[PDB]
Design a protein around this ligand. Structure first.
Ligand SMILES: C[C@@H]1O[C@H](OP(=O)(O)OP(=O)(O)OC[C@H]2O[C@@H](n3cnc4c(=O)[nH]c(N)nc43)[C@H](O)[C@@H]2O)[C@@H](O)[C@H](O)[C@@H]1O
Length: 268
């Protein structure tokens, strides 16, 4: 019934929710449903959300198990053709929703754009198997996914409080969900061991034969935070387990092509 659904999880968002909503309601060229999933804010959040045009805006306000629980409730109710998720500290840039509608017109399942963070572009990676030894390849708040993409992939895994976004996109890649990356900014905004722990866990969900430290090595290698002289060793160790894994490494690290060809030849 709507081109776009925007799911906005909120808790105590009074300082910025107005700006968030203004970036959504101002979007021209589309019909947009907004679902605000509030976790029981005691501040001005609900009143401010109510200060906007309510025609296509639903407010859920009730306790939840966190951001991704709230997102799941919103996604589950969404009626739009493409579904985006915006945090209250985020803004969509002008004309972004019309750009999503235009770029979704041939039936791609995910349309993702660029993200501006503290005035710099997020260092995005390609949506491909190489992302499976990394994190989320684009900003989650720059992502729009269709009803069918959510039906096929499913919901966000609440076990991940930091990286459920990455884990969902990794599932999309593994499920061969189609994706179109648009080279335009869609969204603007401004404990490391826990983040690293979750990111390594997400990678092991793709490749369960990896030790945590090997998942970490691969993540740091693809992101450029660490060295790569052990990639070939990792490839020899596990290549036989999974053609997807061999593919992921040869994409991430094209210099290991001669060794990856050898894994393919012997095992796949
Ligand atoms: C929206 C998500 O934000 C993540 O940023 P991440 O710093 O964790 O989370 P924050 O930026 O602090 O909060 C994100 C949004 O969720 C709301 N919020 C925070 N906690 C809760 C909660 O317990 N329940 C509900 N209903 N709302 C909550 C907050 O008001 C804000 O709009 C991204 O990493 C994800 O990719 C996605 O963009």
């Amino acid at each position: 019934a709507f081109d776009i659904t925007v799911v906005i999880p909120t808790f105590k968002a009074e300082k910025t929710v107005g700006q968030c909503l203004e970036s959504v309601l101002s979007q021209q060229g589309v019909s947009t449903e907004i679902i605000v999933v509030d976790g029981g804010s005691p501040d001005a959040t609900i009143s401010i959300v109510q200060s906007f045009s309510s025609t296509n805006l639903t407010i859920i306000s009730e306790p939840d198990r966190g951001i991704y629980d709230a997102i799941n409730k919103g996604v589950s109710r969404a009626q739009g053709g493409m579904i985006g998720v915006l945090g209250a500290d985020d803004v969509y840039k002008p004309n972004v929703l019309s750009v999503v509608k235009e770029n979704a017109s041939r039936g791609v399942e995910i349309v993702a754009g660029l993200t501006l963070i503290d005035g710099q572009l997020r260092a995005d990676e390609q949506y491909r198997p190489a992302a499976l030894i990394s994190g989320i390849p684009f900003g989650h708040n720059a992502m729009f996914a269709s009803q069918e993409a959510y039906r096929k992939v499913g919901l966000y895994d609440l076990a991940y409080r930091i990286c459920a976004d990455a884990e969902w996109v990794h599932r999309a890649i593994k499920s061969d969900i189609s994706c179109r990356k648009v080279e335009q900014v869609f969204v603007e905004f401004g404990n490391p061991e826990e983040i690293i722990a979750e990111a390594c866990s997400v990678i092991q969900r793709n490749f369960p034969f990896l030790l945590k430290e090997e998942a970490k090595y691969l993540l740091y290698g693809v992101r450029g935070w660490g060295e790569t002289s052990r990639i070939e060793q990792i490839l020899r160790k596990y290549g036989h387990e999974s053609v997807l894994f061999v593919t992921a490494l040869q994409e991430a690290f094209p210099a290991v092509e001669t060794a990856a060809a050898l894994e393919h030849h012997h095992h796949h």
